Write a protein that binds this ligand. Structure first.
Ligand SMILES: CC[C@H](C)[C@H](N)C(=O)O
Ligand SMILES: CC[C@H](C)[C@H](N)C(=O)O
Ligand SMILES: [Zn+2]
Lengths: 125, 119
Protein backbone atom coordinates (compact mmCIF):
# COMPACT_ATOMS: atom_id res chain seq x y z
CA UNK A 1 0.00 0.00 0.00
CA UNK A 2 1.38 3.38 -1.11
CA UNK A 3 -1.81 5.44 -0.85
CA UNK A 4 -4.59 4.85 1.69
CA UNK A 5 -7.99 6.51 1.82
CA UNK A 6 -8.22 6.95 5.59
CA UNK A 7 -11.82 8.17 5.45
CA UNK A 8 -14.41 9.72 3.15
CA UNK A 9 -17.82 11.36 3.60
CA UNK A 10 -20.34 11.21 0.75
CA UNK A 11 -23.72 12.96 0.71
CA UNK A 12 -26.52 13.12 -1.90
CA UNK A 13 -30.26 12.69 -2.52
CA UNK A 14 -33.30 14.56 -3.87
CA UNK A 15 -32.88 18.12 -2.63
CA UNK A 16 -29.22 17.66 -1.73
CA UNK A 17 -26.38 18.95 -3.89
CA UNK A 18 -23.92 16.04 -4.05
CA UNK A 19 -20.70 16.72 -2.15
CA UNK A 20 -17.92 14.61 -0.61
CA UNK A 21 -14.90 14.77 1.70
CA UNK A 22 -11.61 12.86 1.38
CA UNK A 23 -8.81 11.94 3.76
CA UNK A 24 -5.89 10.11 2.15
CA UNK A 25 -2.38 9.19 3.30
CA UNK A 26 0.32 9.41 0.63
CA UNK A 27 4.09 9.53 1.18
CA UNK A 28 3.78 10.07 4.93
CA UNK A 29 1.49 13.07 4.41
CA UNK A 30 -2.25 13.32 5.11
CA UNK A 31 -4.35 15.26 2.59
CA UNK A 32 -7.89 16.42 3.33
CA UNK A 33 -10.26 17.90 0.76
CA UNK A 34 -13.90 18.68 -0.09
CA UNK A 35 -15.84 19.13 -3.34
CA UNK A 36 -19.28 19.09 -4.92
CA UNK A 37 -20.21 17.21 -8.08
CA UNK A 38 -23.08 15.88 -10.22
CA UNK A 39 -23.28 12.75 -8.06
CA UNK A 40 -21.86 11.24 -4.89
CA UNK A 41 -19.03 9.35 -6.58
CA UNK A 42 -18.46 12.27 -8.97
CA UNK A 43 -18.05 14.73 -6.07
CA UNK A 44 -15.57 12.28 -4.49
CA UNK A 45 -13.51 12.20 -7.69
CA UNK A 46 -13.58 15.99 -7.89
CA UNK A 47 -12.23 16.19 -4.34
CA UNK A 48 -9.58 13.58 -5.17
CA UNK A 49 -8.52 15.61 -8.20
CA UNK A 50 -7.65 18.59 -5.97
CA UNK A 51 -5.17 16.46 -4.00
CA UNK A 52 -4.14 14.63 -7.15
CA UNK A 53 -3.52 17.89 -9.09
CA UNK A 54 -1.33 19.29 -6.32
CA UNK A 55 0.76 16.11 -6.45
CA UNK A 56 1.23 16.21 -10.23
CA UNK A 57 -0.57 12.88 -10.53
CA UNK A 58 -3.12 12.57 -13.33
CA UNK A 59 -6.02 10.17 -12.81
CA UNK A 60 -6.72 7.64 -15.60
CA UNK A 61 -9.93 8.30 -17.52
CA UNK A 62 -13.07 6.44 -16.46
CA UNK A 63 -13.95 4.44 -19.59
CA UNK A 64 -16.65 2.20 -18.13
CA UNK A 65 -18.47 1.63 -14.84
CA UNK A 66 -20.60 -1.35 -13.82
CA UNK A 67 -22.25 -2.32 -10.53
CA UNK A 68 -23.57 -5.83 -9.93
CA UNK A 69 -24.75 -8.00 -7.03
CA UNK A 70 -24.23 -11.74 -6.38
CA UNK A 71 -27.28 -14.07 -6.77
CA UNK A 72 -29.87 -13.98 -3.97
CA UNK A 73 -30.80 -10.34 -4.28
CA UNK A 74 -31.34 -8.02 -1.37
CA UNK A 75 -31.36 -4.39 -0.34
CA UNK A 76 -28.40 -5.10 1.98
CA UNK A 77 -26.54 -7.10 -0.71
CA UNK A 78 -22.77 -6.82 -1.16
CA UNK A 79 -21.81 -4.87 -4.26
CA UNK A 80 -19.30 -5.58 -7.03
CA UNK A 81 -18.21 -2.35 -8.71
CA UNK A 82 -16.09 -2.81 -11.84
CA UNK A 83 -14.36 0.29 -13.18
CA UNK A 84 -12.53 0.38 -16.52
CA UNK A 85 -9.62 2.81 -16.62
CA UNK A 86 -7.43 4.06 -19.46
CA UNK A 87 -3.90 4.84 -18.22
CA UNK A 88 -2.91 6.70 -21.40
CA UNK A 89 -3.41 10.45 -21.78
CA UNK A 90 -4.04 9.60 -25.46
CA UNK A 91 -4.15 5.56 -27.52
CA UNK A 92 -5.04 2.39 -25.60
CA UNK A 93 -3.85 1.54 -22.07
CA UNK A 94 -7.05 0.01 -20.69
CA UNK A 95 -7.36 -1.84 -17.35
CA UNK A 96 -9.90 -2.76 -14.64
CA UNK A 97 -10.17 -2.56 -10.84
CA UNK A 98 -12.88 -3.76 -8.46
CA UNK A 99 -14.50 -3.03 -5.11
CA UNK A 100 -16.70 -5.20 -2.90
CA UNK A 101 -18.81 -3.49 -0.22
CA UNK A 102 -22.29 -3.41 1.40
CA UNK A 103 -22.31 0.27 0.38
CA UNK A 104 -22.02 0.78 -3.39
CA UNK A 105 -20.59 4.29 -3.06
CA UNK A 106 -17.84 2.85 -0.85
CA UNK A 107 -17.28 0.00 -3.35
CA UNK A 108 -16.53 2.55 -6.10
CA UNK A 109 -14.17 4.29 -3.65
CA UNK A 110 -12.47 0.96 -2.91
CA UNK A 111 -12.06 0.29 -6.65
CA UNK A 112 -10.52 3.77 -7.04
CA UNK A 113 -8.02 3.19 -4.20
CA UNK A 114 -7.03 -0.10 -5.85
CA UNK A 115 -6.54 1.75 -9.14
CA UNK A 116 -4.45 4.44 -7.43
CA UNK A 117 -2.16 1.91 -5.75
CA UNK A 118 -1.68 -0.02 -9.00
CA UNK A 119 -0.56 3.14 -10.82
CA UNK A 120 1.62 4.48 -7.98
CA UNK A 121 3.09 1.04 -7.24
CA UNK A 122 6.91 1.05 -7.30
CA UNK A 123 8.36 -1.05 -10.15
CA UNK A 124 7.96 -4.79 -9.45
CA UNK A 125 11.51 -5.53 -10.71
CA UNK B 1 -36.04 41.66 2.04
CA UNK B 2 -33.34 41.83 -0.64
CA UNK B 3 -31.39 38.64 0.11
CA UNK B 4 -32.78 35.20 0.99
CA UNK B 5 -30.97 32.09 2.20
CA UNK B 6 -33.10 29.61 0.24
CA UNK B 7 -31.42 26.58 1.80
CA UNK B 8 -28.32 25.44 3.64
CA UNK B 9 -27.13 22.27 5.28
CA UNK B 10 -24.43 22.22 7.92
CA UNK B 11 -22.69 19.02 8.98
CA UNK B 12 -20.22 18.55 11.85
CA UNK B 13 -19.35 16.30 14.81
CA UNK B 14 -16.58 14.13 16.28
CA UNK B 15 -14.68 12.46 13.44
CA UNK B 16 -16.21 14.93 10.99
CA UNK B 17 -14.57 17.99 9.49
CA UNK B 18 -17.12 20.84 9.62
CA UNK B 19 -18.60 21.88 6.27
CA UNK B 20 -21.67 23.67 4.93
CA UNK B 21 -23.53 24.30 1.69
CA UNK B 22 -25.37 27.55 1.02
CA UNK B 23 -28.04 28.48 -1.52
CA UNK B 24 -28.97 32.17 -1.59
CA UNK B 25 -31.23 34.29 -3.77
CA UNK B 26 -30.11 37.80 -4.70
CA UNK B 27 -31.38 39.98 -7.56
CA UNK B 28 -33.12 37.18 -9.47
CA UNK B 29 -30.00 34.99 -9.48
CA UNK B 30 -29.40 32.00 -7.20
CA UNK B 31 -25.92 31.28 -5.81
CA UNK B 32 -24.76 27.91 -4.49
CA UNK B 33 -21.54 27.37 -2.56
CA UNK B 34 -19.74 24.92 -0.28
CA UNK B 35 -16.91 25.19 2.24
CA UNK B 36 -15.25 23.64 5.27
CA UNK B 37 -14.37 25.42 8.51
CA UNK B 38 -13.35 25.10 12.16
CA UNK B 39 -17.02 24.81 13.09
CA UNK B 40 -20.38 24.45 11.37
CA UNK B 41 -21.33 28.15 11.49
CA UNK B 42 -17.74 29.02 10.54
CA UNK B 43 -17.94 26.69 7.53
CA UNK B 44 -21.19 28.44 6.64
CA UNK B 45 -19.55 31.88 6.72
CA UNK B 46 -16.65 30.70 4.54
CA UNK B 47 -19.17 29.44 1.97
CA UNK B 48 -21.21 32.64 2.25
CA UNK B 49 -18.06 34.75 1.84
CA UNK B 50 -17.27 33.07 -1.50
CA UNK B 51 -20.60 34.40 -2.86
CA UNK B 52 -20.24 37.65 -0.90
CA UNK B 53 -16.95 38.38 -2.70
CA UNK B 54 -18.40 37.51 -6.12
CA UNK B 55 -21.23 39.99 -5.55
CA UNK B 56 -18.77 42.58 -4.24
CA UNK B 57 -20.37 42.88 -0.78
CA UNK B 58 -18.23 43.04 2.37
CA UNK B 59 -19.47 41.29 5.53
CA UNK B 60 -19.09 43.12 8.88
CA UNK B 61 -16.76 41.72 11.53
CA UNK B 62 -18.12 39.36 14.18
CA UNK B 63 -17.71 41.26 17.47
CA UNK B 64 -19.67 38.90 19.73
CA UNK B 65 -21.83 35.77 19.57
CA UNK B 66 -24.32 34.66 22.25
CA UNK B 67 -26.79 31.76 22.36
CA UNK B 68 -29.49 31.71 25.04
CA UNK B 69 -32.69 29.81 25.84
CA UNK B 70 -36.00 30.78 27.52
CA UNK B 71 -36.75 29.45 31.07
CA UNK B 72 -37.26 25.73 31.77
CA UNK B 73 -36.06 24.63 28.33
CA UNK B 74 -35.51 20.98 27.46
CA UNK B 75 -33.15 19.82 24.68
CA UNK B 76 -35.77 20.70 22.04
CA UNK B 77 -35.96 24.27 23.39
CA UNK B 78 -36.17 27.29 21.07
CA UNK B 79 -32.91 29.19 20.85
CA UNK B 80 -32.32 32.94 20.75
CA UNK B 81 -28.90 33.59 19.24
CA UNK B 82 -27.86 37.23 18.95
CA UNK B 83 -24.81 38.17 16.89
CA UNK B 84 -23.27 41.63 17.24
CA UNK B 85 -21.53 43.09 14.21
CA UNK B 86 -19.14 45.98 13.55
CA UNK B 87 -18.35 52.41 16.47
CA UNK B 88 -20.73 51.22 13.69
CA UNK B 89 -21.91 48.42 16.02
CA UNK B 90 -25.26 46.63 15.62
CA UNK B 91 -26.91 43.34 16.60
CA UNK B 92 -29.05 40.74 14.86
CA UNK B 93 -31.01 37.96 16.54
CA UNK B 94 -32.34 34.63 15.27
CA UNK B 95 -34.88 32.41 17.00
CA UNK B 96 -35.12 28.73 16.03
CA UNK B 97 -35.34 25.23 17.61
CA UNK B 98 -32.05 24.55 15.81
CA UNK B 99 -29.16 26.65 17.13
CA UNK B 100 -27.04 26.65 13.95
CA UNK B 101 -30.12 27.63 11.91
CA UNK B 102 -30.82 30.56 14.26
CA UNK B 103 -27.31 31.90 13.52
CA UNK B 104 -28.11 31.65 9.79
CA UNK B 105 -31.30 33.67 10.41
CA UNK B 106 -29.23 36.24 12.30
CA UNK B 107 -26.72 36.39 9.44
CA UNK B 108 -29.53 36.72 6.87
CA UNK B 109 -31.04 39.61 8.84
CA UNK B 110 -27.61 41.27 8.98
CA UNK B 111 -27.14 40.85 5.21
CA UNK B 112 -30.53 42.44 4.55
CA UNK B 113 -29.81 45.32 6.95
CA UNK B 114 -26.32 45.85 5.49
CA UNK B 115 -27.72 45.94 1.94
CA UNK B 116 -30.49 48.30 3.12
CA UNK B 117 -28.74 50.77 5.52
CA UNK B 118 -31.89 52.92 5.72
CA UNK B 119 -33.21 49.98 7.82
C1 LIG C 1 -19.56 6.92 -13.19
C2 LIG C 1 -20.84 7.64 -12.86
C3 LIG C 1 -20.99 8.01 -11.38
C4 LIG C 1 -21.18 6.77 -10.52
C5 LIG C 1 -22.17 8.99 -11.19
N1 LIG C 1 -22.08 10.12 -12.15
C6 LIG C 1 -22.24 9.50 -9.75
O1 LIG C 1 -21.50 10.40 -9.35
O2 LIG C 1 -23.03 9.02 -8.93
C1 LIG D 1 -18.75 32.37 16.39
C2 LIG D 1 -18.37 30.94 16.77
C3 LIG D 1 -19.01 29.87 15.88
C4 LIG D 1 -20.45 29.61 16.31
C5 LIG D 1 -18.18 28.57 15.92
N1 LIG D 1 -16.77 28.82 15.51
C6 LIG D 1 -18.80 27.50 15.02
O1 LIG D 1 -18.74 27.60 13.79
O2 LIG D 1 -19.38 26.53 15.51
ZN1 LIG E 1 -22.62 16.47 4.30
Amino acid sequence: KVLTIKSCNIHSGIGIRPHAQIELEYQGKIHKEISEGDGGYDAFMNALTKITNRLGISIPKLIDYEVRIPPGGKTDALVETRITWNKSLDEDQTFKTMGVHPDQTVAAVHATEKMLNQILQPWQI
